[PDB]
Every structure is written in C-alpha cells, then in structure tokens.
Design an enzyme around this catalytic site. Structure first.
Site, short mmCIF file in Angstrom:
data_model
loop_
_atom_site.label_atom_id
_atom_site.label_comp_id
_atom_site.label_asym_id
_atom_site.label_seq_id
_atom_site.Cartn_x
_atom_site.Cartn_y
_atom_site.Cartn_z
N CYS A 74 30.79 28.97 44.82
CA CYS A 74 30.20 28.77 43.49
C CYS A 74 28.94 27.90 43.58
CB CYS A 74 31.22 28.16 42.55
SG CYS A 74 30.56 27.82 40.92
N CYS B 58 28.60 25.42 40.72
CA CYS B 58 29.48 24.28 40.94
C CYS B 58 28.90 23.31 41.96
CB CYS B 58 30.84 24.78 41.42
SG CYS B 58 31.54 26.11 40.43
N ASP B 59 28.51 23.82 43.14
CA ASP B 59 28.33 22.97 44.31
C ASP B 59 26.91 22.92 44.87
OD1 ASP B 59 31.02 22.22 44.33
OD2 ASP B 59 31.58 24.04 45.44
C1 LIG Z 1 35.97 26.14 45.41
C2 LIG Z 1 35.73 26.16 43.92
C3 LIG Z 1 35.10 25.08 43.30
C4 LIG Z 1 34.83 25.08 41.94
N1 LIG Z 1 34.19 23.98 41.37
C5 LIG Z 1 33.93 24.01 40.09
C6 LIG Z 1 33.23 22.88 39.50
O1 LIG Z 1 32.83 21.89 40.11
N2 LIG Z 1 33.00 23.01 38.14
C7 LIG Z 1 33.39 24.08 37.34
O2 LIG Z 1 33.23 24.00 36.12
N3 LIG Z 1 34.02 25.15 37.91
C8 LIG Z 1 34.27 25.11 39.22
N4 LIG Z 1 34.89 26.19 39.79
C9 LIG Z 1 35.21 27.35 38.95
C10 LIG Z 1 36.44 27.10 38.09
O3 LIG Z 1 37.46 26.52 38.90
C11 LIG Z 1 36.95 28.39 37.45
O4 LIG Z 1 35.88 29.04 36.76
C12 LIG Z 1 38.10 28.17 36.47
O5 LIG Z 1 39.15 27.45 37.12
C13 LIG Z 1 38.64 29.47 35.91
O6 LIG Z 1 39.83 29.10 35.20
P1 LIG Z 1 40.92 30.20 34.83
O7 LIG Z 1 42.01 29.57 34.05
O8 LIG Z 1 40.34 31.37 34.11
O9 LIG Z 1 41.53 30.78 36.19
P2 LIG Z 1 42.02 30.14 37.57
O10 LIG Z 1 41.32 28.83 37.83
O11 LIG Z 1 41.76 31.09 38.68
O12 LIG Z 1 43.57 29.82 37.38
C14 LIG Z 1 44.50 30.91 37.24
C15 LIG Z 1 45.85 30.39 37.69
O13 LIG Z 1 46.88 31.31 37.24
C16 LIG Z 1 47.71 31.64 38.34
N5 LIG Z 1 48.20 32.99 38.15
C17 LIG Z 1 47.53 34.16 38.40
N6 LIG Z 1 48.27 35.24 38.29
C18 LIG Z 1 49.51 34.75 37.93
C19 LIG Z 1 50.75 35.38 37.69
N7 LIG Z 1 50.95 36.70 37.83
N8 LIG Z 1 51.80 34.61 37.35
C20 LIG Z 1 51.61 33.28 37.26
N9 LIG Z 1 50.50 32.57 37.47
C21 LIG Z 1 49.48 33.37 37.81
C22 LIG Z 1 46.83 31.50 39.57
O14 LIG Z 1 47.62 31.26 40.73
C23 LIG Z 1 46.02 30.25 39.20
O15 LIG Z 1 46.74 29.07 39.55
C24 LIG Z 1 35.20 26.20 41.17
C25 LIG Z 1 35.84 27.28 41.78
C26 LIG Z 1 36.11 27.27 43.14
C27 LIG Z 1 36.86 28.43 43.76
#
Ligand SMILES: Cc1cc2nc3c(=O)[nH]c(=O)nc-3n(C[C@H](O)[C@H](O)[C@H](O)COP(=O)(O)OP(=O)(O)OC[C@H]3O[C@@H](n4cnc5c(N)ncnc54)[C@H](O)[C@@H]3O)c2cc1C
Ligand SMILES: Cc1cc2nc3c(=O)[nH]c(=O)nc-3n(C[C@H](O)[C@H](O)[C@H](O)COP(=O)(O)OP(=O)(O)OC[C@H]3O[C@@H](n4cnc5c(N)ncnc54)[C@H](O)[C@@H]3O)c2cc1C
Lengths: 306, 306
Positions: A133, A136-137
């Site tokens: 990202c 992000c970084d």
């Molecule tokens: C390395 C890295 C660094 C980042 N740093 C930043 C930053 O500094 N700032 C920022 O704003 N964003 C950052 N991001 C991006 C940010 O983390 C994501 O955009 C955000 O977390 C998306 O949130 P979400 O809830 O949609 O999904 P996700 O964060 O992907 O969370 C989904 C969760 O649901 C779970 N899940 C999925 N399918 C199922 C299922 N069938 N049953 C049960 N549970 C399930 C997954 O295991 C996961 O734990 C970073 C991303 C990465 C990979």
C-alpha cells in the site's frame, strides 16, 4: 433456533465499526471475526493516517481498541470463519464448521486480499520494508531507492504516488507487455523518477531487520542479479474476499460486491456490504471504518422497517 | 501569486482527515478552519461510537488530536472563514476578509448545520440533555422520558430510533399537519412508545446542570404547561453549508453538494466534496472522516493527472 437481528462477517475496521454501531443500537450483533481476525492492520506496524492519533498507533493497537469497543457495547465476537452462507430470504444462515447461526440481516465485511509474490523474505519483512500500500507506507521511504512490482493500473498508480517521496522507483514486471491502460502506462514512462525493468521477477527479498535488497531473475534468459533497495511495494492486484457470496450477491467483473447508489445495500434484501470487499479505489482503514458504520445504520433502519 | 496544490474549507472530521492525507502526500494543504473551528464535535461531550477508543473520548479531545495530526504532517491551518470562492477554471480563488488565496484543487468540507429551536436553555444544555443526533446520543437516555421536536422524516426517523432506548418518546410539532412521508408518519403512530403532541412548541428547556423539563405552549390557544423530561432531541432539519458554492457547484433541492457516483467529484473540475455537506443520510464523525480521506485521495490523483 435463535434468529439474531444481524450477523457481521469480518473483523477489520469495517466489521468492528459495524459491530460497534449495531451493539450500541441494541441489536446484539453476532460477529464472525475469522481465525485471522483483526483485518489487514494486524500485519502492519505504524498507522499514521487514521485520524484521531496525533503521534500514530500500531496496527494491532488500533484493532485492539476497536475490538474492545465492540465488546463494551455488547457485541458477540467469535474468532471463527464463516464457511458457507444462505443469504436469500427473510432468515439468513451462516455455517461455521458444523455449527449454524441465523439472522434477519447480514453485513458483509470480509475485505480484499492483496496478492503476494510468494518469495522468501516477503512476509517476514512486511511492515519493515515490504508493503502492498503506497498510500499507507510511501511516506516512510523519502529519498530512498525502492522497487514496485506489477504490470497493471495498480502498479502504475502505486509507482506514480511513490515518486512523491522516493529518490528512485524501479518498476519490475515479469513480461515486456503491460496490462495497464495506455494513459497510465504512458504517464509513468514520462516520469523521470521511474525506471522500468521488464522480463524481471523478484526471487527473494533480503534483510536481517529491514529490507536491504532484492534478488532478481530474468524471466526469459534466467540471468540473475542483485539490486540494493530499502523498500519493496507489491502491486500485482487484489482479490476481494467474495467467494462466500458468489452466486447469491451481484459482483462486478473483478469480484467486488456491488452496492446500490451511495448506500451499502447489495442486490439481496437484508444484505449490506462495507469495506474493501466493496471499495476498489481508496482501500484505507478510515474509509473502511466509515462504510462499516454506514452498513450498520442502513441495516438498523432496514430492520426497523420490517 | 502563490498557487497552492490544494485548499481545504472546513475543520470537522472531513476537513482534518483530508488535510492529514494531503499533507502526508506532500501537497502542503492550506486549510481554512473557520473561526468556529473543529466542527460539530466541539459542541458535544462524550463520543463513544468513533472506532479506535474503547472507553470513548470527548468531542474536543478527538478534534484536538485530528488538528495536531494534520499539523504534524505539515498542513497550513488558518482559523478564518472563507467568505467567497471562485471555483471555475484551472486556478481557484478563495477570499478571506480582504485576503485572497489560490489553488489548483479545492476540497469542500463545510458540513451541515442542525437547525435549532432558539429557546433559552437549548445551547447551554447541549451535550447535557439536549441533542440534535439520536444515533449519537440516544444510548445515553435508556429508560428515560424524552421529547423529540419536529414534523418531517427527520423527526420520525429520530423518534423511531430513540424508542430503542427511552421509556417514552413524546414527539412535539408546532402544527397538526406533518411534512413527513405517509409511510414514516404511519409507522410512528403505530409505535406504542411514541406519544404525539401537535400544535405544541417548546418555549424553554429547564435544568441547572442537566435537562430536567421543558416549558410548552400551544401554538393555537397559547395554553402553557410544563413537561418533566430528561432529554430533548431537536430534529427540525439541517442546512448544508453550501451557500459559498451555490451557483457554481450543482446542489440537490435541499442544498447538499452533488457528487459523481461513489466518488467525491463535484460538477466542477478540480473541486471535491466530503462530509455532511454531501451526506444527508448518516451524519457521523466516522463517515465524515472517511469521505474526507476519499476527497483527498481523489484530489491527489486528479492533481497527478494535470
Ligand atoms: C500491510 C498493510 C498496511 C496497511 N497500512 C495502512 C495504514 O497505515 N493506513 C490505512 O488507513 N490503511 C492501511 N492499510 C489498509 C487497511 O488495512 C485496509 O484498507 C482495511 O483494513 C480494510 O478493512 P476491511 O474491514 O474492509 O477488511 P480487512 O482489513 O481485510 O478485514 C477483513 C477481516 O475479515 C476476516 N474475514 C474474511 N472472510 C471471513 C469469513 N469468511 N469469516 C470470518 N471472517 C472473515 C478476515 O480474516 C479479516 O480479518 C494497510 C494494509 C496492509 C495490507
Ligand atoms: C451535538 C452533536 C453531537 C454529535 N455527536 C456525535 C457522536 O457522538 N458521534 C458521531 O460520530 N457524530 C456525532 N455528531 C455528528 C458529527 O459531529 C458530524 O456528522 C461530523 O462532525 C460532520 O463532519 P464534517 O466535517 O462534514 O462537518 P462539521 O463537523 O460541521 O465541520 C465543518 C467545519 O467547517 C467550518 N466551516 C464551514 N464553513 C466554512 C467556511 N466558509 N470557511 C471556513 N470554515 C468553514 C465549520 O465552522 C466547522 O467548524 C454530533 C453532532 C452534534 C451537533
């Protein structure tokens, strides 16, 4: 036999924010967090652009706050994965192993996986030089020499943003053809900070505490080399975690869940979707948190209509 | 003579989150915060549903974090109101008193004002019994007797949500006709926790530390009475702060700034909009923060295209 008001699938910022709102609204949400709970921020270190933290916060610290906040208002959190869903009709079912749970509304918050190279060093150095990202970084690599891997609009977009910081960006792609749009491809070739390295792949990412270099291989000749860099940005695409709902909820051609207008309504009554499962543009924790709130408000008001 | 990359107008969660992202992207954003800076959360007490704070945080504490976070990455913050804008064309101008400032992109984040009754006690007891946001504050009135003021869909929506908590909700309206939709009006009359009090207005909100009652007046006969209640929810509408941009940016019939699709693009090139200036559905700090991030990413990527 118990039919809950709402089940939430996922425990990133979207899922926990939906759970906070639903629990504070007395919906007693049942949240399946996954065994790899806490979303994408569990795998990173410092989060500096989530508003509300003037000196930042680690990814796990922030997700711990969200989870405890959901618990404080009465969310029922289970660190288990949903394996199958039946989302059509007034009573929706999720299957977790050999257990089943039911609800009138379902909030989908499963996120999107960033694709990985699958090479030694990539996972160990994630958060210490390796990232998926740039938004992000990229700030952490001011005046450093870094690489970006990939051949599509994502790689062009990431590589473009990174030149705001880095001394040099070497864009590596395993072919000499690019899947990226003609406009995106043409602009990066014009950017003097970007160097293209086609027919090339990374075989290993080096570094004992932080990234210090990559091992390269020519995908045509096999010629190998070493490149000293202190950052590696992997931009080879994303896979929205929509497999559970394919065939029941309308998806776009890349697998993202479609929503109606500016709402979180999916194509199915009583089913709402938030976070990076839906958003293929911003992919930030704060935008995911916002949409998880919106899904919870949509669901609460839809439940009140029944 | 200096043309900045981006000017941001407003200092609620949307403006500060846009400023954090733009500053961390090295755009050196110039932010006009207003003299009443900090947005709607400056006027409240405990904020419990903004994700990331397991025991909550006061409105001003949270906005102080956001402002210091914007400063940390280099935002230029000015506690002054924009008085006029010229938003059409490659170089946009804002006028602040007798000073002028220019930018290639403008992010509009001026928010929406909740309408107030304008009666003694209303402002002093805001955050101590008086509120304009059921989603925000209804949780604090479990098993209490409260009132809701207003005659439209907003009042029906707020009154409906409040019955999840309150022992009784008395909905007060100054006429015997209701501007609310037939569906919304019919549902609340069916809700046994809601009591309708038509042809009635509040003339004063009582209470030495917290709300203890309201003084009422019949708008037809003038008959006055007292009602013991511990909460007053004012739901007589909102006024998006779009006056600055009327006639240059397309607005809907209620004055909200229109945006394209799921983006923050307005009808004008280089002009983006976030927060409650746009959103007339959720109106939460976390959704405003999310859209302010989205506006900043849209603007950054649009700037890179120029
Ligand atoms: C390395 C890295 C660094 C980042 N740093 C930043 C930053 O500094 N700032 C920022 O704003 N964003 C950052 N991001 C991006 C940010 O983390 C994501 O955009 C955000 O977390 C998306 O949130 P979400 O809830 O949609 O999904 P996700 O964060 O992907 O969370 C989904 C969760 O649901 C779970 N899940 C999925 N399918 C199922 C299922 N069938 N049953 C049960 N549970 C399930 C997954 O295991 C996961 O734990 C970073 C991303 C990465 C990979
Ligand atoms: C009493 C109250 C309590 C609330 N409690 C909660 C809660 O617990 N949880 C929650 O999530 N939400 C809560 N909210 C709602 C939340 O505060 C708003 O939804 C959110 O702040 C909207 O953010 P915004 O940036 O779009 O606009 P605003 O918060 O309205 O901020 C806009 C700012 O820009 C300034 N501005 C406007 N025009 C100009 C101009 N021309 N020049 C310069 N500056 C300008 C304004 O003065 C203001 O400071 C509450 C709201 C109120 C009123």
């Amino acid at each position: 036999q118990t039919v809950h008001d709402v089940i939430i699938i996922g425990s990133g910022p979207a899922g926990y924010t939906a759970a906070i709102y639903a629990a504070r609204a007395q919906l007693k949400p049942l949240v399946f967090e996954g065994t790899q709970f806490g979303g994408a921020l569990m795998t990173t270190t410092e989060v500096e652009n989530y508003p509300g933290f003037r000196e930042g916060i680690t990814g796990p610290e922030l997700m711990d706050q969200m989870r405890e906040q959901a618990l404080r208002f009465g969310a029922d959190l289970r660190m288990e994965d949903v394996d199958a869903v039946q989302l059509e009709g007034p009573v929706k079912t999720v299957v977790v192993g050999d257990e089943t749970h039911q609800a009138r509304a379902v909030i989908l918050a499963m996120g999107a996986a960033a694709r990985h190279l699958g090479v030694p060093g990539e996972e160990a150095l994630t958060g210490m030089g390796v990232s998926t990202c740039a938004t992000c970084d990229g700030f952490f690599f001011r005046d450093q020499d870094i690489v970006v891997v990939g051949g599509g609009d994502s790689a062009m977009e990431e590589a473009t943003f990174l030149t705001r910081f880095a001394r040099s960006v070497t864009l590596i792609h395993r072919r000499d053809e690019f899947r990226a749009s003609k406009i995106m491809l043409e602009r990066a070739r014009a950017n003097e900070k970007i160097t293209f390295l086609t027919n090339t792949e990374i075989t290993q990412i080096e570094g004992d505490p932080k990234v210090t270099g990559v091992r390269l291989r020519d995908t045509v000749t096999g010629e190998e080399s070493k490149l000293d860099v202190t950052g590696v940005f992997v931009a080879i695409g994303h896979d929205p975690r929509s497999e559970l709902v394919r065939g029941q909820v309308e998806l776009d051609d890349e697998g993202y869940v479609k929503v109606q207008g500016r709402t979180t309504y999916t194509s199915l009554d009583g089913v709402f979707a938030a976070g990076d499962l839906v958003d293929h543009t911003y992919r930030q924790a704060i935008t995911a948190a916002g949409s998880g709130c919106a899904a919870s408000i949509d669901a609460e008001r839809w439940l009140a209509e029944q």
